[PDB]
Design a binder for this molecule. Structure first.
Ligand code: HEM
Ligand SMILES: c1ccc(-c2cnc[nH]2)cc1
Length: 375
């Protein structure tokens, strides 16, 4: 279980992320902490081009390597996208590309900013004795003033944390199936449903902290990657590390282990078949920390909860199972309504969307298809 790097309180999020690196990395830190100013005044690219190549050896534990990935990922997005108006750099200068690629190799993550960087490791409490609540929290790194990165990253994190309450019930579910403990199983499924239902109320905060225009025209640009992307159609050159340009997708909650883990738990076969949705979410597991992709693989290998419940002729168990599935459907329906507000409407107002909505609707429909009763 410890091999899976799951926290009792914060689940897949990194507990108490580190905020400072060794003084040896001050040159990186200085750029990452001043991105909005450096990007806006046109100083960011020259500063990156001027860095000396720093060795990754003095980053000696997981938390410091994770902070360094966050730093280097944010700087890389700023260097590639610049001021976010379509002037793009196609080559990442060796003095940053090399350590970023070596550090990424060591962490078994791709050399692009991922969800586990900009959400799961990108946070702090304001006051260490107050709860994990939005008002008591902040992000460590933003891209531009007004980009709403705080509201976007933290609300994602707060959903991620609410879902965590359900993760610790998972071994109860499997124990109860194998021990033939019907009441324990039912109580465990109801508890999972309850937490997933709570996570939905958390998502409502998106409307308070994120504004559609800033999201659509700024933050979305900085989180974009270079896979299937016409602005960088062969991907990015990581100078001095690979000879040929490489394609990696940009930051995506398709990379969240929370939602992928409940679909697997419940037998929702989100990654089955050869369709586009299934392959994208399968591919995103490559963008998750290895301990969390290990967790998902081990869930896949357990007896099927859905098969257990379907074979008992037990209405209580069916209804509890269905409450879990329904909770995921309600989350995904609410999320679709967010996407209409934050992407479809802004894109209509500026002087594509259907493929996005069709991906999301495929995943919601696959979830709905798992209901045992029409729920
Ligand atoms: C402004 C708010 C948001 C917008 C515009 C938005 C947009 C999108 C888009 C475009 C995708 C498709 C995948 C991709 O392009 O990378 C997606 C997928 C997804 N988003 Fe969001 N999102 C928002 C907030 C959230 C939050 C707060 C969460 C909670 C962690 C979340 C969880 C998901 C999940 C899990 C997927 C994968 C599909 C699924 O499992 O249903 N999103 N989102
Ligand atoms: C950081 C935080 C959230 C996201 C996201 C939300 N929905 C899809 N991706 C991507 C990066």
């Amino acid at each position: 279980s410890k091999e899976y790097h799951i926290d009792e309180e914060v689940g897949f999020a990194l507990p108490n992320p580190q905020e400072n690196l060794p003084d040896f990395y001050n040159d990186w830190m200085f750029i990452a902490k001043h991105l909005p100013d450096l990007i806006e005044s046109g100083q960011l690219r020259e500063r990156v081009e001027k860095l000396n190549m720093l060795s990754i050896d003095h980053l000696t534990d997981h938390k410091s390597q994770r902070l360094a990935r966050l730093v280097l990922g944010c700087i890389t997005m700023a260097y590639v996208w610049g001021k976010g108006h379509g002037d793009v750099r196609k080559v990442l200068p060796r003095n940053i590309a090399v350590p970023y690629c070596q550090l990424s190799k060591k962490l078994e993550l791709p050399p692009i900013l991922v969800y586990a960087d900009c959400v799961l490791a990108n946070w702090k409490k304001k006051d260490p004795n107050k709860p994990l609540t939005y008002e008591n929290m902040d992000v460590l790194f933003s891209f531009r003033d007004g980009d709403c990165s705080k509201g976007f990253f933290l609300v994602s994190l707060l959903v991620e944390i609410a879902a965590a309450s359900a993760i610790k019930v998972i071994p109860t579910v499997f124990k109860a199936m194998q021990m033939q403990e019907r009441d324990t199983l039912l109580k465990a499924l109801l508890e999972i449903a309850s937490c997933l239902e709570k996570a939905l109320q958390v998502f409502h905060q998106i409307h308070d902290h994120v504004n559609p225009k800033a999201f659509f025209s700024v933050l979305r640009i900085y989180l974009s990657g270079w896979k299937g992307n016409p602005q960088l159609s062969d991907g990015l050159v990581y100078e001095g590390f690979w000879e040929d340009p490489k394609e990696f997708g940009g930051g995506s909650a398709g990379q969240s282990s929370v939602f992928q883990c409940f679909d697997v738990l419940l037998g929702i076969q989100q990654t089955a078949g050869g369709g586009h949705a299934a392959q994208f979410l399968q591919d995103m597991r490559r963008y998750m920390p290895p301990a969390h992709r290990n967790f998902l693989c081990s869930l896949e290998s357990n007896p099927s909860v859905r098969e257990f419940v379907l074979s008992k002729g037990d209405a209580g168990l069916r209804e509890a199972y269905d409450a879990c599935v329904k909770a995921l459907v309600s989350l995904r329906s609410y999320h679709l309504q967010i996407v209409t507000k934050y992407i479809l409407i802004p894109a209509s107002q500026q002087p594509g969307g259907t493929d996005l909505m069709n991906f999301l609707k495929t995943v919601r429909s696959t979830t709905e298809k798992s209901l045992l009763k029409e729920g």
